[PDB]
Symmetry: C2
Subunit: 402 residues, 2 copies
């Protein structure tokens, strides 16, 4: 931060405070994560200066960004086994838009788990039908998904996308999609790191198209990626450029390469096994104390707690109470939530980031204890001060970026 | 680079080679540039880890105290530079900025009237709207505003766009606004090429007249790669919701902090001095090339861009020219001149821009030498000794003006 402190003290101080915020709070923000120094060094490189419209081999001065882009693609194939990879999407939404633009005509029907946040492009230019989860199980009901598919005849079925805490069976989506002659897209943003580590089934075996963010469980820089069958390659590539993007962010793409190389290491699997163990420990500990967990558990890194049903606090109340003791999570609409969307019945907890900084089972059992202390005693200052001190013990035990 | 070198040698190596390629070559690629080490440090920061859906003070996930500071500073500095009523710094790229504007100003199928020089359509703007092009006059190779007006009256665009193309002359936004008002169209300016010049006061500011102004934050503005929308207050709600949740999700806050840094740099007095040199350098390059017998599209330049009619001057195609110059260490793009009779991937022209070389310190004397090198190589494209001479003269300039 040498040059930036000299040039722009006010931005440099804000950046340092953001580092200290990430360090002094236990963030349990869904699928979010901490990237490596290597990843940040790539994003911060001179590749930001490069103008590289087009694709490797067919862009010019692009000889070296051809190397970093092609290695991003190679590593992506090694991780996920996809026939064709595009590492140019600027974000998940850009990856998603390109797929929709290829798979659909405007006005066509799409069947997906929930409509993101209609303002969203997917709801505006297409007839988006949601399947959600069953009111009794709080999980996907494949019978229900199939009935909707037969009734609405979507041209595209989407699985994933939502921050869902249970396994998604892509074989059963493929069966349903084939029955109604729909293409299948999976947005694996939340679970891509689990997929990479073999701990969630891989949608590439079944999907026409797979989109993802490169950040989150995959622990890369913020950005997107599309994997698809070879038959869609030409349309997908031209849709990304010049369809909806221009030049790619080659510094970010190099950083994608770095992250993908990390994900191919044996210790990434160990990492993701710890992420999932930690989430199970957290859920179980909360359950042991009377907290109802949506769907009664988790199969992944996410834990959704019904705080309203368990202790009578709203999700908004739970969120603020936790933030005040140093735990950052988000209020969450539970399935068929009676509370308004601004208030909600739930909070959503995710283990990737705290696991990256070193948290293990004992640490997550203590996090469960802290959460329970704070939420069950939300008006008791001594209790809250205790919780805050216990959060402080954990952060000091596991400092960020050492 | 120590962490990447330790962990991922292949990538570290490629990045080091890229740095060396930037240093060893004289890059004259239209509006491209070299950002500061401060800008890179911001992009390379831990702000990449932060999920910050929404806008400052109105976020969907909490813990946004500090990214609210950086995003708010980027907005405030953008207003100080361009005088815009509303600014959105979240667009991931120029094309995301542009798409958001079109989604707000237009319904699918509506007519839009916009410049094109490069000439179903693959671009979103051409595929989902009825995009009518204006270009330049065949004889002047400049915008003919009576023709623009004629097209507007004939086609009744709901949106008229000015800028966007890599045009070498000043664009009169007053005349565009008069035409837009006549046909009851909104006016958008894509100032990506000229944003730095506008910030420096060297090109008139389209914010005075436009409903919407889009830009990249890189190029002449010399910032990180990304987008920005400036717009009248009356469109602020629709614009912000079209960017999020319309077509994007979380912003890239590390990049936005890097925007703030670039905008800070652009506010300094030395930025105007830099832009003055950019434009002087391009005049020198154009005039030196004319003295060497090259025809310049429109006869010269008002900005950082110099478009050369290589086919009409010496009988090489833009493709041959681009290749010959790359072999001697000069990077430029072939381009379609107006009413170009060569095929689209062959072309008659090359386009040169001065921002990047100016950033590394080139002055008038340096750019006169660039013209002579270009003339030597292009006029002797099959003469190994003269090409090696060109190559050596490039190496003298790159040694004189090392990067970073």
């Amino acid at each position: 931060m040498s040059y930036i402190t000299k040039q722009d003290k006010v931005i440099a101080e804000a950046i340092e405070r953001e580092f200290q915020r990430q360090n002094s709070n236990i963030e349990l923000i869904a699928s979010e994560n901490f990237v490596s120094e290597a990843v940040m060094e790539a994003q911060g490189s001179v590749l930001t200066n490069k103008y590289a419209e087009g694709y490797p081999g067919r862009r010019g001065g692009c000889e070296f960004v051809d190397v970093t882009e092609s290695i991003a693609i190679d590593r992506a194939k090694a991780l996920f086994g996809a026939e064709h990879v595009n590492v140019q999407p600027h974000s998940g939404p850009q990856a998603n838009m390109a797929v929709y633009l290829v798979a659909l005509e405007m006005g066509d029907t799409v069947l997906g788990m929930n409509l993101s946040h209609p303002v969203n492009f997917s709801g505006k230019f297409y007839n988006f039908v949601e399947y959600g989860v069953d009111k009794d199980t709080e999980r996907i009901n494949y019978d229900e998904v199939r009935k909707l598919a037969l009734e609405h005849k979507p041209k595209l079925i989407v699985a994933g996308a939502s921050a869902y805490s249970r396994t998604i069976d892509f074989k059963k989506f493929k069966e349903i999609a084939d029955e109604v002659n729909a293409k299948l897209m999976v947005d694996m943003a939340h679970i891509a790191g689990l997929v990479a580590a073999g701990l969630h089934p891989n949608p590439v075996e079944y999907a026409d198209f797979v989109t993802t963010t490169t950040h989150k469980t995959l622990r890369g820089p913020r950005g997107g990626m599309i994997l698809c069958k070879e038959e869609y390659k030409k349309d997908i590539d031209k849709t990304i450029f010049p369809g909806i993007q221009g030049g790619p962010l080659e510094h970010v793409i190099a950083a994608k390469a770095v992250a993908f190389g990390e994900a191919l290491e044996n210790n990434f699997k160990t990492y993701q096994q710890q992420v999932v163990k930690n989430a199970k420990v957290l859920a179980e500990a909360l359950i042991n104390e009377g907290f109802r967990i949506v769907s009664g558990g988790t199969d992944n890194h996410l834990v959704a707690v019904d705080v309203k049903g368990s202790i009578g606090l709203t999700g908004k109340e739970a969120e603020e109470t936790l933030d005040s003791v140093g735990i950052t999570c988000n209020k969450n609409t539970i399935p068929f939530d009676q509370e308004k969307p601004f208030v909600t019945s739930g909070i959503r907890l995710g283990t990737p980031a705290a696991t990256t900084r070193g948290f293990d089972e004992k640490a997550f059992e203590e996090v469960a204890k802290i959460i329970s202390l704070a939420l069950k005693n939300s008006k008791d200052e001594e209790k809250l001060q205790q919780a805050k001190e216990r959060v402080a013990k954990l952060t000091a035990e596991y400092p960020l970026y050492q």
